[PDB]
Amino acid sequence: NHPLLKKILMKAPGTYHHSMMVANLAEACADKIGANSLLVRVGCFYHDIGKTLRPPYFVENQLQGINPHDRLTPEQSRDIILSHTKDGAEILKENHMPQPIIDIALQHHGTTLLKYFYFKAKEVKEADYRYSGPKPQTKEIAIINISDSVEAAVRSSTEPTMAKITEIIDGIIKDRFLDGQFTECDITIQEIKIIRDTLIATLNGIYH
Ligand SMILES: [Fe+3]
Ligand SMILES: [Fe+3]
């Protein structure tokens, strides 16, 4: 591995394994709709590199029942999570990575709402609990957004049927559609359907 990629494996082995899995999912979707597969693959490898700044605050790096967000305000939690896109982009820039890889790290959550920490701060304005974006500017980044959300949800679920996995994927796509996250790229509804069906198929080769 390249020094940059190995620093992900060493500091945040969960994030690493997660990123490899996303790359697999997302590249398969890129194939099926004839998007830029190789940009998608390598973009996923680095998309979460901003988590290397504070690895234990991301669940894929945590041990069961040991969550550092307990000793934190929602605000503190939000500031750490919302930062990792911007921080990843900055790390990538400082390492003179190609701009499309930089764009992916910055945009892969679009402007989505951190809803958990948003409605824990009920028990205040949405804009403060949303990623800075921009929203995905390309089909490729939209694919990654969906794949990334799907990977993490299935990973953290215990432990899912094909029916559950389908439900998770449809929920996320619905969410993205209703929240307008894909209105600044050219991804088609037909492509969304292909992506959706490819994720179901790939994930079942993985969960049997
Ligand atoms: Fe991320
Ligand atoms: Fe991710």
From TrEMBL:
Residues 15-153 form the HD domain. Fe(3+) 1 binds at H18, H47, D48, D148. 3',3'-c-di-AMP binds at K51, E60, Y131. Fe(3+) 2 binds at D48, H84, H108, H109. This is Lmo1466 protein. The chain holds residues 497 to 708 of 718 of the full protein.
